[PDB]
């Protein structure tokens, strides 16, 4: 059973701006997704201080970067707090509305797309490099879900029947045909070192076979 939802008009507008604007410095998408993963990890770690049982779904706090050339995907996996169904449909988008308006105003005043994370809507930079984004997520208080959007104004949510993740979030970037440099080990290594070198969780860059 697949549910289809419309983005808020303001978020659709943000996504079209990201897709349509000419802007060569696309690599910052990775910093933004890793930053989100670090925030999610910080959150479950803080909650576990007063309720250790929140780590019964997995003690390890880490980020994995997994390229796959056959599928032309780059996956950013974390074992952070995860997202509930309400997070996926409502909560994050509610919070994103104000960040989007501020980001739009900053751009008109001379900011650039690389500053998107300073407004709390860095996730949508994924559409600098991906034609489709799939998000698999599992929060301790909810079931495992799959969210997906190719932009165009809509997204879907369904219960996920794939491999159980335990707890956390996988962001699967279905890369655009001209963005496959982000599958290469040396390129990902370079970007992590430049923009994410002090993240307080181990980042493991998987190798392809
Ligand atoms: C990467 O997984 C998550 C899970 C929950 C949350 C987030 N990311 C952000 C976007 C940092 N805000 C949340 O509430
Ligand atoms: C997976 O990490 C995130 C971060 C921010 C956001 C999202 N996911 C969705 C739920 C797609 N909407 C957001 O604003």
Swiss-Prot record:
Modified residues (N6-acetyllysine): 43, 69
Keyword set includes Repeat: no
Domain notes: The TPR repeat-binding motif mediates interaction with TPR repeat-containing proteins like the co-chaperone STUB1.
Biological process terms in GO annotation: activation of innate immune response; cardiac muscle cell apoptotic process; cellular response to heat; cellular response to virus; chaperone-mediated autophagy; chaperone-mediated protein complex assembly; mitochondrial transport; neurofibrillary tangle assembly
Gene (name only): HSP90AA1
Identification of the protein by name: Heat shock protein HSP 90-alpha
Keywords: Acetylation, ATP-binding, Cell membrane, Chaperone, Cytoplasm, Host-virus interaction, Hydrolase, Membrane, Mitochondrion, Nucleotide-binding, Nucleus, Phosphoprotein, S-nitrosylation, Stress response, Ubl conjugation
UniProt-annotated location(s): Nucleus; Cytoplasm; Melanosome; Cell membrane
